[PDB]
Symmetry: C2
Subunit: 238 residues, 2 copies
């Protein structure tokens, strides 16, 4: 019965104290579903210009190196949300048509069958969970069951990794005060320092001080990078 | 069996052609679960300073007016994601401790029991689906079943409303070109016009033209409101 699985899995992921426990449980789960490999890959919303990509996987280490060397990330259909239905994507041959070097290379390292599930996280990072397999051997699993289990799996592992503050999920930290974020919102709303000073009954200098303070913390050139970063990662709102 | 419910519901929401069909189906679903009322409320990520809140509900119309008049939105615990587990929130008395005028007033208009489910949408809007009920009469439903059904319901109705472009879900539109968004990313990354001109091999004037163009479209005072808006709603990335 799906329901008790769900409940068991919710608690198990609740209790965990390390990243290594999370990864180890994903691996276990992949095996219950007769997959050999898992990959947990997270695309950050920032930097806007080259988004951070962090992963943990037990793929053959040679495959990780080769995949990076050829920069397959750019063409990986399995990491493009546009290809998904219901947050689910079953690998097959057509999927790879726009990426034939990847397909070949993946098979050459023994990734024959696969599947991925994605989720956007509360911080706007996209998390992808892939399972793949050595054998082309048919393993009948109910489509609906795999889907729902992976749904839970990708979410729970990633929420745990967040609770644990792991480097794979965390966006740049913006430890900002009530007043700083308030200034930041009016900035994102297109208000000038003068205008903010008016709105908040504090001097233009103080507004500017707060601005430079936020920039020091996050090491940003100007207010606009700060506001964008807060806006993209959810840190800007109330 | 949950699985065929799911599959029936996926297709039904797929096929819909109007908002009014979506709302009517939610109402139906609420009734199958012996609730009288539904509410579909969506908190937008923008304006940053007073986020848009749009809803469709069949609550008693007098309750909608009263709720607004007393500005209960500000204190509504049922619309605050911090209160949720697994995107689910069962109404009860403790929940309302920080909001006792709301609790009384809600009961006085006959909202006795209730439940809400939320979801962050691909555009970063938060969608909430509430069911409530007239009677305090005990209706045994498996916690896990309600949860999963509402999960599907809140997501599907809101995705349909998006496919349909309904005013309740849509963020301000930013019909921008490849080049405009490219300029926008470097802006959000804190780059100056001069620097962008360098990076893109085009003149400072042209960069500025693009900037003013984006501002005209969206009626924004400066580049920084534009970039923030694109960053918050997902429109800025690749």
């Amino acid at each position: 019965d799906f329901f008790s699985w769900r409940r068991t899995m919710l608690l198990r992921f609740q209790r965990m104290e390390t990243a290594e426990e999370v990864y180890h449980e994903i691996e276990l789960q992949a095996q219950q579903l007769e997959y050999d490999y898992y990959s947990l890959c997270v695309r950050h919303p920032v930097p806007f210009t080259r988004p951070k990509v962090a992963f943990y996987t037990n793929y053959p280490e040679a495959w990780v190196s080769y995949y990076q060397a050829k920069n397959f990330l750019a063409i990986d259909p399995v990491l493009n949300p546009e290809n998904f239905s219901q947050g689910h994507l079953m690998w097959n041959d057509d999927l790879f048509s726009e990426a034939q070097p990847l397909w070949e290379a993946a098979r050459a390292h023994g990734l024959r069958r696969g599947v991925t599930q994605y989720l956007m996280l509360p911080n706007r990072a996209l998390g992808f969970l892939s399972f793949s397999r050595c054998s082309a051997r048919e393993i009948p699993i109910l489509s609906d069951e795999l889907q729902l289990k992976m749904q839970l799996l990708v979410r729970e592992s990633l929420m745990a990794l967040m609770r644990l503050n792991d480097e794979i999920v965390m966006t740049p930290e913006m430890n900002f005060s009530k007043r700083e974020k308030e200034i930041l919102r009016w900035t994102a709303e297109g208000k000038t320092s003068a205008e903010i000073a008016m709105i908040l009954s504090i001097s233009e200098n103080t507004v500017n001080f707060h601005q430079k303070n936020m920039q020091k913390k996050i090491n940003a050139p100007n207010k606009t990078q700060v506001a964008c970063y807060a806006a993209a990662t959810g840190l800007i709102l109330e």
